[PDB]
């Protein structure tokens, strides 16, 4: 299945994923498209930030679901 | 060291801090990776509310010590 990732600069990327894919893997598949390191990426879904350990099936994310990209500023 | 900050919804947040970090620092890290401003943050450890201006060693926060976060809205 594929899900949408929308960013604050208007870029809409549709990334082919799987319910078993972890959030660390979907972030790793975004840097291959834009170059943003996974540590900066903050994925937002239904007003909740996806944790770096769980899979996107723990959040019941379905096909054609939209994710919002937020970038950290300092890290750590 | 890695500490955890859980909320009331059930989300756990893993932070990699140091025993000498101040509480204004750990609130800044929560804002940086979760977006909530520090004014809406209230850290609880063993029922005691964390007072801004003290290091994590003042509250004897070992590694993997789970903190609790409640919003101020």
């Amino acid at each position, epitope marked *: 299945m594929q899900i949408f990732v929308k960013t604050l600069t208007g870029k809409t990327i549709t990334l082919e994923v799987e319910p078993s894919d972890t959030i660390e893997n979907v972030k790793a598949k975004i840097q291959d498209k834009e*170059g*943003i*390191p996974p*540590d900066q990426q903050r994925l937002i879904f239904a007003g909740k930030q996806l944790e770096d350990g769980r899979t996107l099936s723990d959040y019941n994310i379905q096909k054609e679901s939209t994710l919002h990209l937020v970038l950290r500023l300092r*890290g*750590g | 060291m890695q500490i955890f900050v859980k909320t009331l919804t059930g989300k756990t947040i893993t932070l*990699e*801090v140091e025993p*000498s970090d*101040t509480i204004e620092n750990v609130k800044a890290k929560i804002q940086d990776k979760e977006g909530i401003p520090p004014d809406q943050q209230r850290l609880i450890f063993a029922g005691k509310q964390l007072e801004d201006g003290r290091t994590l060693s003042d509250y004897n926060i070992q590694k993997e010590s789970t903190l609790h976060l409640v919003l101020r809205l």
Partner: antibody, heavy 124, light 108 residues
Framework: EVQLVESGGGLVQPGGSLRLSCAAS????????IHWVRQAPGKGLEWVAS????????YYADSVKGRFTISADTSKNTAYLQMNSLRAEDTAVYYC?????????????????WGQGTLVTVSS | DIQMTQSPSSLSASVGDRVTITCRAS??????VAWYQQKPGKAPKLLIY???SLYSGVPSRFSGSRSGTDFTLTISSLQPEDFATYYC?????????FGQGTKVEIKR
């Protein structure tokens, strides 16, 4: 594969204007932070301005507030620094640096890559 | 704001000596401190970021450390190509401030 190329520096009379450009390659300015640091002759490094192009946040130092305008064009992947009302104390080597993730996870961000530096000289 | 204070201002140690550079922070900065090296006539290069993390491409003889508001840059095998000026940086609050600098020369 990532580098920052600067331009715009040179000689200018006090009170004149200069626009420094910072061409970026290997990354997207619209997703990274770009700062400016100057070094006066015989002095150390002083922070000038900064941009967080993802949100549009710009910050300045009290010594250049109201005179310098920092901007970023995403189309050509370039960050600009419009310097106005230049004084003699502005003569320095201005650097363009990217601020962000530096390699190890769960670590604070730092300025990893810098430009070669351009020289702005201000005198009559 | 938050200003760094480096010590000492200048050093001189022979090849192989272990030299430390002290950087004292104004307020609490956490680990948001980076070390930079500026060789004469070149741009500042990043050495140690996030208080103690080593950057890719920097020799392993450079290291950083944190203890409260104090940060130390240490070089184990001081080589002739280490003559430069070293600046600690504060990347916590946005008015970014550097250290005064530390010129290190080789004792010959």
């Amino acid at each position: 594969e990532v580098q920052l190329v600067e331009s715009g520096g040179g000689l200018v009379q006090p009170g004149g204007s200069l626009r420094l450009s910072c061409a970026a390659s290997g990354f997207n300015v619209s997703y990274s932070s770009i700062h400016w640091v100057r070094q006066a002759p015989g002095k150390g490094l002083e922070w000038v301005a900064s941009i967080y192009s993802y949100y549009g946040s710009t910050y300045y130092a009290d010594s250049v507030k109201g005179r310098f305008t920092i901007s970023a064009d995403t189309s050509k992947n370039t960050a600009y620094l419009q310097m106005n009302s230049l004084r003699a104390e502005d003569t320095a080597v201005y650097y363009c640096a990217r601020y962000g993730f530096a390699g190890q996870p769960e670590t604070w961000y730092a300025m990893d890559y810098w430009g070669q530096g351009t020289l702005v000289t201000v005198s009559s | 704001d938050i200003q760094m204070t480096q010590s000492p201002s200048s050093l001189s140690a022979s090849v192989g000596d272990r030299v430390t550079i002290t950087c004292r922070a104004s307020q609490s900065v956490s680990s948001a401190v980076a070390w930079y090296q500026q060789k004469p006539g070149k741009a500042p290069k990043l050495l140690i970021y996030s208080a103690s993390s080593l950057y890719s491409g920097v020799p392993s003889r450079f290291s950083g450390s944190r203890s409260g508001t104090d940060f130390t840059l240490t070089i184990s095998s001081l080589q002739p190509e280490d003559f430069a000026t070293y600046y600690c940086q504060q990347a916590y609050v946005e008015p970014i401030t550097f250290g005064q600098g530390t010129k290190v020369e080789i004792k010959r």
